[PDB]
Design a protein around this ligand. Structure first.
Ligand SMILES: [Cl-]
Ligand SMILES: [Tb+3]
Length: 129
């Protein structure tokens, strides 16, 4: 599923991401845009052999099991393929655990380099929220 901008903002809001760990909704929508272009099926291989999955490009090195990241962890206790579903529940619940780690949203490279310090509210402008 390729979400529309406001559609993703509404789903994220419903699942409790808006202001989660102090990050406004626009931060999450901006991160999803530059991580996956709002595509739940996005996958990207990393140089170390782990893979990033889904709308928020969650890494198999720590957070999900894909069966091909030797010596990795599965801190969200889910198969990585659950993060590719049309239903963002799994990705949202796992993102809440990631942003609760020491570095907050800096865990998302595209957020730090393309969203952080920008007018993030522009990512929800015009949406009926
Ligand atoms: Cl915002
Ligand atoms: Tb940690």
């Amino acid at each position: 599923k390729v979400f529309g901008r406001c559609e993703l903002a509404a789903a994220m809001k419903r699942h409790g991401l808006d202001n989660y760990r102090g990050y406004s909704l626009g931060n999450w929508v901006c991160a999803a845009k530059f991580e996956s272009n709002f595509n739940t099926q996005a996958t990207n291989r990393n140089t170390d052999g782990s893979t990033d999955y889904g709308i928020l490009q969650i890494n198999s090195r720590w957070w999900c099991n894909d069966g091909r990241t030797p010596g990795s962890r599965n801190l969200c206790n889910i198969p990585c393929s659950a993060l590719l579903s049309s239903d963002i529940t799994a990705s949202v619940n796992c993102a809440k655990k990631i942003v609760s780690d020491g570095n907050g949203m800096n865990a998302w490279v595209a957020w730090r380099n393309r969203c952080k310090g920008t007018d993030v509210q522009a990512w929800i402008r015009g949406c009926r929220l």
